[PDB]
């Protein structure tokens, strides 16, 4: 099955989790996990009124390998680590390890990678496909007949 | 306890009933409850392709306990090989009515409720009693202040 | 070209129109064409508070046939289609409800005026793809990189 | 005079935008400018298969007739080889600043006024001065009473 996601949708999960992190006065800062935290970290960053948001890119290489392409400095302390979900926490483990002081949240979270994470908005089944808005768009669609 | 409803999942909600409804040659029209199931009827007419739209237009108020109702206009007929379509079903008060001017009707809605779950043919999608359904016809994109005013 | 309108806009161009429509006591009643003006006058029916909603369903076979037609010559009635290209349609719905005010939202220039009101102009070569048409699925990004 | 701007529609702008910077091969990366030119920077970076997406954070702060700058934080480099992405250019005073940061950078937006509109590289949507810029992040979907209380 797929879970659809339209931008309204994922504003509203936004400012659900941007209230939880109130006040926003204890963060220096947000640290986006590219590309999948872009969106979500710039409505939190709206919401909370933090200016200072920065990024972390990693990319994959028998074994999967975790490349880490650009980095933003530090351990975290102070800084929100944010991503658009968390499947497994494959990913989700290269994070806590740069930034251990960082508090890690995400909107979507499924069974296994829903451990790793200091918060979430909506729990997904783990068999279920996230469609993210990004991948989407405003197309004819045939009648059914 | 609020269930916001964005014109995408009402529009997915509608084209899940659509399928169920084929095919297309089976009805005569679409009985559109006034003023709830118009966009939903809408929906249905364009994606079964049905071209035979009319309604039936029914106001209620509530006086403490009882219930006023009136039948502004009402479409001819028992329903027969028809679609009565409503945008949701509560209480049922509404359903109840509805069942009666048109017995040989499919009757069918895109939300149901426990209490009116039982007087609807076919429906989409559960919604808890205490939950108060917002539809998208009234609401609107609008600015809204930053959660703080950092 | 194609004139994209999605759900949002839609509403916005009803709500500009229904705001011209007022007072809302003038108004007997509206009668939507099917089916595009069923949406538009769905809009303008709970926009001005106007319970009496009915249609009238013409086809064709350039043969013009009612299937279905609200009584009366559309006094104190709005008759409402989503747009006006030529006015074939609009000239025979002037014909059945004379004395009722016949409103759009787009409006073509060979179809302007057969018009009493509509919103937005669109040129005569554009073709307007309306959000019932539409629907929000998976489109592949502009590159395979 | 506001121009209200929805997510669908700044999509669609932002993939006309992608049409023109292809083929992405000569693109190294992606410099967004906080907050504006967030989610134009990751509707870019989807549709060129980007995934080198960095930031430059400048702080505003208008004191009568002049602005103070602070940079928060900044990406390394002159930008070549990478494109800087903002929201829109109103009176151009962001751009200026930026294009001195980075003037080996493809400097774009989505909305242009223009007073802003001869220090962009490239732009989709050609806005007045005197209109307001309604954008996505800013708004939501809330309830929205009827015009009229009948
Ligand atoms: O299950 P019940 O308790 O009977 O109520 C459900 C009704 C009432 C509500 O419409 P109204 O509140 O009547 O308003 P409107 O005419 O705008 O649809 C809704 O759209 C259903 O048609
Ligand atoms: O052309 P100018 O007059 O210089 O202003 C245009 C700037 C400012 C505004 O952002 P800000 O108001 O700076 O706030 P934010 O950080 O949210 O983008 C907008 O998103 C552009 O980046
Ligand atoms: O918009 C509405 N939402 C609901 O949940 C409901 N129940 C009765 N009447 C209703 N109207
Ligand atoms: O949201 C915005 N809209 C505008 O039109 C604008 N101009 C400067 N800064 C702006 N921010
Ligand atoms: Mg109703
Ligand atoms: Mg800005």
Redesign the interface.
């Known amino acids: 099955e797929k879970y659809?996601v339209?931008?309204?949708?994922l504003?509203?999960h936004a400012?659900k989790l941007?209230?939880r992190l109130?006040?926003?006065?204890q963060w220096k800062?947000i640290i986006?996990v590219?590309?999948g935290g872009?969106?979500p970290?710039?409505?939190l960053?709206?919401?909370?009124?933090?200016?200072?948001?920065?990024?972390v890119?990693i990319?994959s290489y028998n074994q999967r390998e975790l490349k880490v392409?650009?980095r933003a400095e530090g351990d975290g302390e102070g800084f929100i680590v944010i991503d658009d979900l968390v499947d497994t926490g494959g990913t989700a483990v290269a994070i806590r390890e740069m930034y251990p002081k960082a508090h890690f949240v995400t909107i979507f979270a499924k069974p296994a990678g829903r451990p790793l994470v200091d918060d979430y908005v909506v729990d997904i089944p783990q068999d279920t496909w996230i469609?993210q808005?990004?991948?989407?768009?405003?197309?004819?669609?045939p009648?059914?007949?």
């Open positions: 659809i339209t931008w309204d949708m504003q509203i400012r941007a209230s109130m006040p926003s006065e800062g986006a590219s590309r872009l969106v970290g710039a409505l960053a709206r919401e909370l009124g933090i200016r200072h948001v920065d990024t890119c990319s392409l650009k469609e808005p990004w991948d989407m768009g405003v197309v004819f669609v009648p059914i007949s």
